[PDB]
Design a protein around this ligand. Structure first.
Ligand SMILES: CC[C@H]1OC(=O)[C@@](C)(F)C(=O)[C@H](C)[C@@H](O[C@@H]2O[C@H](C)C[C@H](N(C)C)[C@H]2O)[C@](C)(OC)C[C@@H](C)C(=O)[C@H](C)[C@H]2N(CCCCn3cc(-c4cccc(N)c4)nn3)C(=O)O[C@]12C
Ligand SMILES: [K+]
Ligand SMILES: [Mg+2]
Ligand SMILES: [Mg+2]
Ligand SMILES: [Mg+2]
Ligand SMILES: [Mg+2]
Ligand SMILES: [Mg+2]
Ligand SMILES: [Mg+2]
Ligand SMILES: [Mg+2]
Ligand SMILES: [Mg+2]
Ligand SMILES: [Mg+2]
Ligand SMILES: [Mg+2]
Ligand SMILES: [Mg+2]
Ligand SMILES: [Mg+2]
Ligand SMILES: [Mg+2]
Ligand SMILES: [Mg+2]
Ligand SMILES: [Mg+2]
Ligand SMILES: [Mg+2]
Ligand SMILES: [Mg+2]
Ligand SMILES: [Mg+2]
Ligand SMILES: [Mg+2]
Ligand SMILES: [Mg+2]
Ligand SMILES: [Mg+2]
Ligand SMILES: [Mg+2]
Ligand SMILES: [Mg+2]
Ligand SMILES: [Mg+2]
Ligand SMILES: [Mg+2]
Ligand SMILES: [Mg+2]
Ligand SMILES: [Mg+2]
Ligand SMILES: [Mg+2]
Ligand SMILES: [Mg+2]
Ligand SMILES: [Mg+2]
Ligand SMILES: [Mg+2]
Ligand SMILES: [Mg+2]
Ligand SMILES: [Mg+2]
Ligand SMILES: [Mg+2]
Ligand SMILES: [Mg+2]
Ligand SMILES: [Mg+2]
Ligand SMILES: [Mg+2]
Ligand SMILES: [Mg+2]
Ligand SMILES: [Mg+2]
Ligand SMILES: [Mg+2]
Ligand SMILES: [Mg+2]
Ligand SMILES: [Mg+2]
Ligand SMILES: [Zn+2]
Lengths: 111, 120, 44, 44
RNA sequence: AUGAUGAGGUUAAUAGGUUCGAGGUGGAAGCAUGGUGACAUGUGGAGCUGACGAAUACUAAUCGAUCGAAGACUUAAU
RNA sequence: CGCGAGCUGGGUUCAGAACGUCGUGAGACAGUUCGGUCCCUAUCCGUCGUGGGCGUAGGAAAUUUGAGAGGAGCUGUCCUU
RNA sequence: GACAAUGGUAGGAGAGCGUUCUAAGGGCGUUGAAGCAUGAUCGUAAGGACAUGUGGAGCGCUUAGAAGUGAGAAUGCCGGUGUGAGUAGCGAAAGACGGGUGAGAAUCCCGUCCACCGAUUGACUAAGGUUUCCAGAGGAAGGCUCGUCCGCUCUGGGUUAGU
RNA sequence: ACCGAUAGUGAACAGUACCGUGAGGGAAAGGUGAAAAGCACCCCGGAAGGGGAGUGAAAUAGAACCUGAAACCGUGUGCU
RNA sequence: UUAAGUUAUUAAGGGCGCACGGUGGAUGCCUUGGCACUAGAAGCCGAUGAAGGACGUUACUAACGACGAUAUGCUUUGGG
């Protein structure tokens, strides 16, 4: 079947998460794990935990093969934005958006 | 030669510190560029230690730090004494190449390439 | 000094064509999962 | 550089405090206005 | 600048080290001698020496992975 | 009167002050004099460099023709005749 | 039936569409109202239906009445979200290594070495602030990075005068 | 034949928060469900957050909780 | 085989349509709060210490309401 995991309101901007997500989309689970382990980006361990959670869902809840799984879907949606301000010169305040992400991973055996 | 993002005095001091730390601990983890620079410093020091004469010892004292090392049981020695003692004897029959660098991969804080440099 | 016109979705994504990262240069560990090429395991 | 507000407990109480407001008819008018508006703080 | 370009990757001199040179500096330290001493002379064109030259696998260029054709049709000469 | 999102800011249209002159005056000038803040992280076209993609009817390594384009183009003195 | 007329700004005239509310009449609705979404539907226009999904309790139609009755522009007001852009910046400086802790360490703790101030980057009073002080626990937010740390969060404490 | 949460009081939860030496100025912010029945237990994870299993008529009603438009941000691809 | 000629395949990315998500809080429904009035009554208290506050009071404790060291209340008369 298909198993899924979601990490919601991760405090990383979706632009940055999607860069790493683009690497593992469509790949085999073990290859994706290796890619995430060896990718030097802040999103990598968060995405790795989501993928591990999806694989654990597969195995425990649906008795899936755990070795024939591919990353069928991998995407990051926009979560709520923390609005912040940075003092600038002349007594002016500038907006800072501390964006969040919803990260989804779907694994499947292809059957 | 590399500048290592430091002024000449700072770079010289850091290279002395790294070389003494390597002599003491025999195996240190640093960045790639620092290790590639310090291999030359440490190996020239080992050359002086193999030479062994008084002038070589004083030339080595120009570079080494004044650190003390507690050995097996409450017996102390200086890094210079270790360099002209155990380290020099270890490499009597080796003609250069007393160190090696092993790459570890990027580290979390800044993505810098961590490496191990050790005495051979 | 300032954009005369806003950048459309099309132009922005065109510009981002090359904004990406590449798969790490990685090799299977013959004895000790996967590792960066020319690096030690450092964890095995 | 030196700014306009240099705090001083005594100065603040003597110029804007309750007793200074009670000391004049216009100060009592201030207190009456602030009571009418429903202010939590009537004076220093 | 980064890409790129070029020299190399063990069937190897690509870089570092080592050994020996070029060039630079200009006479190391230690010791001896002379001098009350500052110093001087000798050992001795000494000692030191980034980038330059050579030799030498001592150290590092491991293992490995990825991409990459199978040659369309129509008419003419052969 | 090419060129200040390339520079300067001596002059000129700024607040101070003074002279000559005019005006009762506040002030003023076919005038003069000393002093007097030059902001901007380049989106598009344009320009200088430098890469990736695909095409070029198989794929590749190297050597190349040159449609076309750019560059260059100055001149003195002396001697001899 | 057969003749004519029908470009149009300011502006004049006429006829209509739709919104909310009211009265009267007649209806719909948990066998699913309003709203929302999609559709290849109807009308001369404003606009009107139907079908399906979502939704979960109200709403049409007819005639008449009354209006906070129709927005694309006001450097309009409020809210949300883009672009510029992974761009500018990250606020005067010297750090290195070992060991520890931890899910995670350039950034926390400990150690050694190095370095900076020293008519002061040292020590003590005053004003001002008002719990920021201490211990134990924490890591969502705050800290221009990180964080196991903190002047941040939780819990419990702490200020003693005849001079 | 008054408003219905940008309306109606500034204020449905406030002369508060915040700003100012002061007089004074002055917000934003309503809705789970009929009933808390507010998710026992298992699994990944330090946690956060999820996937199941349950409650419920409904959990894309799970507390940032009725409906959930548009801008804006993504994933897949029929034609190009 | 050659020559001459014709026309594909690619999509780094982009465009249109469609499908499915996120964000956001419009819209509809709703009302705890307002707005404008009508009728009856009443309007102003205080040195017998007012208006308005400060500080306290609950077993636990921040704020608000109530209360005042008889404190999250006491007595009494009626209601319930
Ligand atoms: C140096 C920064 C200033 O730039 C300038 O002064 C110049 C060099 F950018 C400038 O003079 C520009 C060029 C001016 O525009 C010209 O105006 C002319 C009339 C016409 C001309 N064109 C159209 C022909 C225009 O281009 C004008 C009006 O600024 C006075 C622009 C307007 C928008 C203007 O007022 C702006 C806001 C002006 N200003 C007043 C400064 C007023 C003078 N000032 C104040 C300060 C200051 C204040 C606080 C702290 C510190 N440390 C310094 N420094 N200088 C600022 O606070 O900032 C700037 C940008
Ligand atoms: K000598
Ligand atoms: Mg300021
Ligand atoms: Mg360098
Ligand atoms: Mg110096
Ligand atoms: Mg001109
Ligand atoms: Mg100028
Ligand atoms: Mg110009
Ligand atoms: Mg000038
Ligand atoms: Mg006169
Ligand atoms: Mg001058
Ligand atoms: Mg030509
Ligand atoms: Mg051409
Ligand atoms: Mg000539
Ligand atoms: Mg007409
Ligand atoms: Mg006509
Ligand atoms: Mg009219
Ligand atoms: Mg009409
Ligand atoms: Mg109408
Ligand atoms: Mg309605
Ligand atoms: Mg209107
Ligand atoms: Mg507008
Ligand atoms: Mg914006
Ligand atoms: Mg942007
Ligand atoms: Mg960049
Ligand atoms: Mg830019
Ligand atoms: Mg830049
Ligand atoms: Mg920068
Ligand atoms: Mg700083
Ligand atoms: Mg000093
Ligand atoms: Mg503390
Ligand atoms: Mg942080
Ligand atoms: Mg605290
Ligand atoms: Mg609403
Ligand atoms: Mg309101
Ligand atoms: Mg749940
Ligand atoms: Mg769950
Ligand atoms: Mg569950
Ligand atoms: Mg649930
Ligand atoms: Mg729903
Ligand atoms: Mg909702
Ligand atoms: Mg693509
Ligand atoms: Mg949407
Ligand atoms: Mg109580
Ligand atoms: Zn390994």
């Amino acid at each position: 079947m298909e198993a899924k995991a979601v990490a919601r309101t991760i405090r990383i901007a979706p632009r940055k998460v999607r860069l790493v997500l683009d690497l593992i989309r469509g790949k085999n689970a073990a290859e994706a794990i290796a890619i995430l382990k060896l990718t030097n980006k802040a999103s990598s361990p968060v995405i790795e935990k989501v993928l591990m959670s999806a694989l654990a869902n597969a195995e425990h809840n649906y008795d899936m093969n755990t070795d024939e799984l591919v990353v069928k879907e991998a995407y990051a949606n926009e979560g709520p934005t923390l609005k912040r301000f940075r003092p600038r010169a002349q007594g002016r305040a500038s907006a800072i958006n501390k964006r969040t992400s919803h990260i989804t991973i779907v694994v499947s055996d292809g059957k | 030669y590399r500048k290592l993002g430091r002024t000449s005095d700072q770079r010289k001091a850091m290279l002395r510190d790294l070389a003494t730390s390597l002599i003491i601990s025999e195996r240190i983890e640093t960045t790639e560029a620092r290790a590639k620079e310090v291999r030359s410093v440490v190996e020239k020091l080992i050359t002086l230690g193999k030479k062994g004469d008084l002038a070589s010892r004083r030339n080595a004292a120009k570079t080494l730090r004044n650190v003390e090392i507690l050995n097996e049981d409450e017996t102390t020695q200086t890094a210079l004494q270790k360099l002209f003692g155990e380290i020099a004897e270890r490499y009597t029959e080796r003609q250069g190449g007393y160190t090696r660098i092993l790459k570890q991969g990027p580290r979390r804080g800044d993505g810098a390439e961590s490496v191990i440099i050790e005495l051979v | 000094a300032v954009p005369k016109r806003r950048t459309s979705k099309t132009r922005k994504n065109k510009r981002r064509t090359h904004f990406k990262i590449s798969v790490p240069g990685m090799t299977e560990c013959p004895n000790c999962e996967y590792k960066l090429s020319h690096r030690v395991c450092k964890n095995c | 550089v030196k700014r306009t507000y240099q705090p001083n407990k005594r100065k603040h109480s003597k110029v804007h405090g309750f007793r200074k407001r009670m000391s004049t008819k216009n100060g009592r008018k201030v207190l009456a206005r602030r009571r009418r508006k429903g202010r939590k703080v009537l004076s220093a």
